[PDB]
């Protein structure tokens with residue numbers, strides 16, 4: 595018998611716990627004949643703040659984490675390419691792209707971990723208390739939360755005043771008037787009542803969504819290496835590209851009930867097209883250009899990484 599401590603920041607009802615890590619742990623339990631037991635600690639129940647999850651798993655404080663890569667700026671620089679404006683297709687396609695990217699050109703970002711999967715949410719949407727966002731200009735003066743440095747820079751480039759914070763802080767920042775809105779996909783919102791606190795929602799039409807942000811599902815390397823050959827095989831049968839594909843499929847599906855909750859609560863949903871959409875995409879090109887230069891400055895071939903990311907997304911877009 596092996597006990598593995600899983601740690602993450604969302605509360606127990608959040609999809610990442612209840613509909614991803616919990617069934618993963620049940621499949622791992624079943625396929626190891628009750629021998630590999632994951633103990634799930636949501637809501638930072640083993641201590642620390644969300645950016646520390648990667649340190650905890652790296653150092654063996656815990657054995658497995660689910661987190662947002664960009665909650666620790668600069669630590670996973672290759673993955674930033676997938677956060678650039680208008681990169682994501684479905685979570686299913688974009689998650690497989692992320693995993694193959696990490697398996698190949700971006701492996702150095704995660705060399706200190708056992709990678710279970712890297713994947714992402716369905717494209718994020720724009721949420722405000724009441725003001726409909728029809729164009730970039732409607733964001734002028736609005737304090738808008740994003741999850742990572744790349745996404746806050748996108749918000750600045752669309753005219754907003756960016757504020758960064760992990761998602762559990764958003765509701766309080768809204769109710770206290772510290773932010774006027776945020777970007778998140780639908781799926782995370784009900785776990786924090788965010789569809790009650792924002793009634794105006796904007797998405798984009800077409801085949802590339804506003805943004806996504808990579809999730810990391812990681813195991814401590816030494817702990818993985820200590821497992822028996824048979825236990826490694828159970829873990830690996832529940833890791834890699836197949837898991838990233840399943841995760842992306844799940845995250846696409848998670849949008850559906852969450853969107854319905856938001857509209858049932860009195861929300862509006864507006865979908866940018868035409869001129870307003872083109873204006874946002876043109877603004878995004880500026881961030882893409884500056885990101886490529888910033889990757890160059892950090893020793894990466896920024897142009898090659900952006901091309902690779904785009905090509906992998908389209909490869910898996912079926």
Ligand SMILES: O=C(O)c1cccc(O)c1
Pocket residue numbers: 662715740741760761777778779781782
């Ligand atoms: O925007 C985020 O920080 C976030 C965190 C967890 C799940 C998710 O869909 C989004």
